[PDB]
């Protein structure tokens, strides 16, 4: 089984790439976690069907973008119409979501500054990654619309926040990615996410339902 996540400004080398290969234990999911999830909704899938995928939030390779391509990317924001991009791949089955970057200039200026690497400038990509995804035998991944419609790109999606590592050499550019839920981040519906042993940061998490 294999999962990759990629987060980028469309057209350009990803800010963030991560590979999952859960990780990593024999069981797909904690067996209280489906009883606490199933109860929180108040679908017929069993523990062997539910995968908890966890992405290390630091990109797995340094950002390899050329300065010129990076400059071009920033300039594109100076005028109009660009979209955030991200993709999930198992393992054959993929989905990519496009999230429009607001034409609001005070925030386009915030992205631009973040892309330049200024301290104190995250890149908010709101409602951009699903906490839950469904992977089928044929075709691209799908959303569990049932789960979505209960919660309140799509409205129930998690939001992303991306930061460039500060103080590193020009050939060592890391984006770090953080996630959070819309509304109550503490809701029981959310399978709680783990942190990493090596860095102490939260995993990027998606719960997959397998067919
Ligand atoms: Pt197994
Ligand atoms: Pt198992
Ligand atoms: Pt600023
Ligand atoms: Pt780093
Ligand atoms: Pt940090």
From Swiss-Prot:
Tell me the residue ranges located in the Cytoplasmic compartment per UniProt: 1-211
Q: Where in the cell is the protein located?
A: Cell membrane
The knockout note for this entry states: Reduced brood size due to defects in ovulation with incomplete constriction of the sheath cells impairing oocyte transit, an accumulation of ooplasm in the uterus as a result of 'crushed' oocytes, caused by incomplete opening of the spermathecal-uterine valve, which in wild-type allows the fertilized oocyte to be expelled into the uterus, and sperm navigation defects.
Q: In which tissues is it expressed?
A: Expressed in the pharyngeal-intestinal and spermathecal-uterine valves and in multiple reproductive tissues including the germline, somatic oviduct, and spermatheca. During reproduction, it is expressed in sheath cells, sperm, both spermathecal valves and the spermathecal bag cells.
Q: What else is known?
A: Piezo comes from the Greek 'piesi' meaning pressure.
What family does this belong to? Belongs to the PIEZO (TC 1.A.75) family.
Q: What does this protein do?
A: Pore-forming subunit of a mechanosensitive non-specific cation channel. Generates currents characterized by a linear current-voltage relationship. Plays a role in reproduction by positively regulating inter-tissue signaling to promote oocyte maturation, ovulation and fertilization, and sperm navigation from and to the spermatheca. May play a role in regulating cytosolic and endoplasmic reticulum calcium ion release.
Q: What is this protein called?
A: Piezo-type mechanosensitive ion channel component 1
What is the gene name? pezo-1
**Span of the full-length protein shown?**
2077 to 2341 of 2442
